[PDB]
Amino acid sequence: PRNKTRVVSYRVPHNAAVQVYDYREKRARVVFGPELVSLGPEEQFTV
Amino acid sequence: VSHQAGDHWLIRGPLEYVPSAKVEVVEERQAIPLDENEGIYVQDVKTGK
């Protein structure tokens, strides 16, 4: 079971992109390539 | 500070309290924690708003 208190992170694959929206800072971001994407308290992944 | 009979007031925060013989403790009351997007609805019963 996932420890809900730990920062949620996703390892983005090579030649892929992830879209995240910060529902509190109101800032949109798309992360390309191999990178570790971590979500702030109110950020959410686009599914 | 002065209060009329039947007045309510709130005391808060880091303190010691012993109720004066003229005072009734009505309830224990506690803060509600809320992040920058979270909220509550409150009714001000004196005005109704």
Swiss-Prot record, chain A:
Induction / repression: Up-regulated by IFNG/IFN-gamma.
Residue ranges of MVP repeats: 8-47
Tissue: Present in most normal tissues. Higher expression observed in epithelial cells with secretory and excretory functions, as well as in cells chronically exposed to xenobiotics, such as bronchial cells and cells lining the intestine. Overexpressed in many multidrug-resistant cancer cells.
Modifications after synthesis and translation: Phosphorylated on Tyr residues after EGF stimulation.
Domain of life of the organism encoding this protein: Eukaryota
Localization per record: Cytoplasm; Nucleus, Nuclear pore complex; Cytoplasm, Perinuclear region
Biological role: Required for normal vault structure. Vaults are multi-subunit structures that may act as scaffolds for proteins involved in signal transduction. Vaults may also play a role in nucleo-cytoplasmic transport. Down-regulates IFNG-mediated STAT1 signaling and subsequent activation of JAK. Down-regulates SRC activity and signaling through MAP kinases.
Complex and partners: The vault ribonucleoprotein particle is a huge (400 A x 670 A) cage structure of 12.9 MDa. It consists of a dimer of half-vaults, with each half-vault comprising 39 identical major vault protein (MVP) chains, PARP4 and one or more vault RNAs (vRNAs). Interacts with TEP1. Interacts with PTEN and activated MAPK1. The phosphorylated protein interacts with the SH2 domains of PTPN11 and SRC. Interacts with APEX1. May interact with ZNF540.
Annotated domain remarks: MVP 3 mediates interaction with PTEN. MVP 4 mediates interaction with PARP4.
Name of the protein: Major vault protein
Covered residues, full protein: 451 to 497 of 893
